[PDB]
Design a protein around this ligand. Structure first.
Ligand SMILES: Nc1ccn([C@@H]2O[C@H](CO)[C@@H](O)[C@H]2O)c(=O)n1
Ligand SMILES: Nc1ccn([C@@H]2O[C@H](CO)[C@@H](O)[C@H]2O)c(=O)n1
Ligand SMILES: Nc1ccn([C@@H]2O[C@H](CO)[C@@H](O)[C@H]2O)c(=O)n1
Lengths: 283, 283, 283
């Protein structure tokens, strides 16, 4: 199913008729970082499988819902259960939910992920406000926009110079200073590793020489689709580990360790993004 | 449709029977740089859609013709309307037109493109004679030759050490010196960004550290197919902007600016390539 | 055909019923390096085309057998005729033979390949014990594990920190010292170039700046599938040429030169791996 104007309108048509919510903000949350979706007030849970033209996720299994309601006085829509391209989802399957957000009226998309640290300043449990990226799939002919362009959403050749909104980064840092956890907050450049294998020790060393601060398996596809159709983005990485240190010490990585870091910071991040949503200037 | 010996012979069979032209030179021209195709003498325009086994381009739309005739006393064939891989065309769809050029008797292929400047010496409106490339899709398993090899056209493992003919670069520079615009002409290494998003500021910074002078979304696939079947290549980039400077100054890129640079240099480039065609030693 | 638990069990079911061999070691040999497969004692040759669910190789042609028998008192299984991803084989087609090895009881996989030298210390005819890799397809969303995970074989997110067994590298070096050819043996990092074009001169120069010692078109996919399902790996590159030197001197590469180097070292490598198999501690 192509992520075109007609198909995306058919999904939005069904969603408007079931929720009666016109969302202003969209959110996509990382592994173990979805507690905020459970506190959405006056919420309506819509399974992906019930929405026309939404991608099939029964092979991968696990949760897949669209949740609408209120947070901090603002109306929001949330993807519960993330679509990652290492699962095999196509360019069209990634793009359609974001373009449906657009047709519903979303103007700001907030994103969290788990990622590995490259910069020597990054420790486990730190946060990184993303100010740019290095898109290795995009350079290698696997950009999420490869294919015919859907002119109703954006141009054929998008410029990504301002994909990460400066004002949103400044607002997120300001709130961290008000609650005195700014010592955990950095900024940096995110490298998109297709996955699903973690970055190898020598791949980590190469990324250090290329000026990457952080590496992960998600986020960049959603950022490009949002920037294509004029949605502003804030993206925050939670550092699971420092891969450069782990290479020097021959320390392994695994998803259980990653989830444990997510649990250590889940409540702080939920408090953080709730204040961001409340203070957001909508554009 | 596979770009094999039989299918390519069937397209050449139809073209010979309609044009009565045996071309020696092939040309592929960049965006806004196609004026020379309009001055082809005793010309025959053959729409792609009429040629057996030629790829379907109705989804992307816009022009798609094969034009044959004379330039500077030489017989040439031109692709009017370029096939870019960010549109979604497959390896077989890119390869077939070049191999048809081979079966018609083409021995030299001339190429122009628009590209972003990385080297600090490059300014908007400059030209770069390409002497090598960095093929990020090729490294990432998206090489244009991925698939079964068509032995009638070339070997399984091609060497690209001499894909860009030294003598052609020297001839192109010589003509620029005769008309006193050699101050616009550089040489450098071309990085293949799959597209269709422009190179991000941090991607541009990485390319600077890797010794890339220029980055663009085309050309490398055609160069490899030509080198595979023994066709000599000259490739010239027109610099739309300096992406390293634009990152320092937070200046955006867009296709309208790119086309405006193409218009500023279109007539000079047409004059330049017409003299190249006229003086070419055919091999 | 998906490389899942059921399909792989059906291939192993057929193989057990035809060979009556329970192999402990698997081997995959590079171009021109397959002489050891001819000395397998009490051997049973099983064509790929006769094994249920094995990938179709009639388009590429050439040999495709599974060979079982004894070497050095140990029971082994060998792939005769390698599956390379530049031929167009899918992720599932690469993975199934290795997972069938797993279900037959393989605990150690030994691999040889031909590759180009980047490190200035490497000369034609040298050997490189691989201690890590840089997986350019994997970074670019063409990782061999892209797709749904097959939970019966391994986890969704594998760690590759110890994909190349330290003890096996130490054993291979020890045997080279016992026979006084340790002056030919190095260790280094392997870069995976998707192929099938050889690394370009400027691509070679980039790899030097990134800390790659060796570049080739194979091996990394098999290493990842083996590490996924808990099989230990030793991988050795035979250096066909030094691509950095060849760029400085404008010297070409071709498959005939590569095969000639393979013939120069074939008997030494066969003797080397036969002793490795004999001395292997099985785990
Ligand atoms: N180094 C890492 C570590 C974690 N992750 C993210 O967390 C999950 C896998 O641990 C996956 O959801 C993955 O996106 C990552 O991408 N890269
Ligand atoms: N930085 C740039 C700038 C331009 N281009 C080429 O020009 C058109 C898009 O502007 C496209 O046709 C594209 O090939 C490019 O590839 N890279
Ligand atoms: N520079 C090189 C040289 C050789 N090879 C390997 O050898 C065969 C092609 O020569 C192919 O089988 C290929 O794997 C390579 O991968 N890279």
């Amino acid at each position: 199913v192509v992520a075109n104007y007609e198909n995306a309108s058919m999904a939005a048509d069904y969603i408007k008729r079931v929720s009666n919510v016109l969302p202003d903000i969209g959110i996509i949350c990382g592994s173990g970082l979805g507690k905020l979706i459970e506190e959405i007030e006056e919420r309506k849970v819509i399974p992906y499988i019930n929405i026309p033209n939404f991608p099939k996720t029964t092979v991968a299994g696990h949760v897949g819902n669209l949740v609408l309601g209120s947070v901090g006085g603002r109306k929001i829509v949330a993807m519960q259960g993330r679509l990652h391209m290492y699962e095999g989802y196509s360019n069209q399957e990634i793009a359609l939910p974001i373009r449906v957000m657009k047709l519903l009226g979303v103007r700001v998309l907030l994103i969290t992920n788990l990622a590995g640290g490259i910069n020597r300043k990054l420790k486990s449990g730190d946060f990184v406000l993303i100010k740019g990226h290095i898109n290795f799939p995009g350079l290698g002919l696997n950009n999420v926009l490869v294919g015919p362009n859907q002119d109703e959403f954006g141009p054929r050749f998008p410029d990504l110079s301002n994909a990460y909104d400066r004002l949103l980064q400044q607002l997120a840092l300001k709130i961290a200073q008000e609650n005195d956890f700014q010592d955990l907050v950095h900024e940096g450049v995110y490298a998109f590793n297709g996955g699903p294998t973690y970055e190898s020790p020598d791949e980590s060393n190469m990324l250090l020489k290329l000026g990457c601060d952080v590496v992960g398996m998600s986020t960049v596809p959603e950022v490009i689709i949002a920037c294509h159709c004029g949605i502003k983005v804030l993206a925050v990485s939670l550092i699971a580990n420092n891969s450069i240190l782990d290479a020097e010490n021959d320390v392994s990585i695994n998803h259980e360790k990653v989830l444990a870091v997510a649990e250590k910071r889940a409540d702080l991040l939920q408090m953080w993004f709730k204040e961001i949503i409340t203070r957001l200037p909508l554009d």
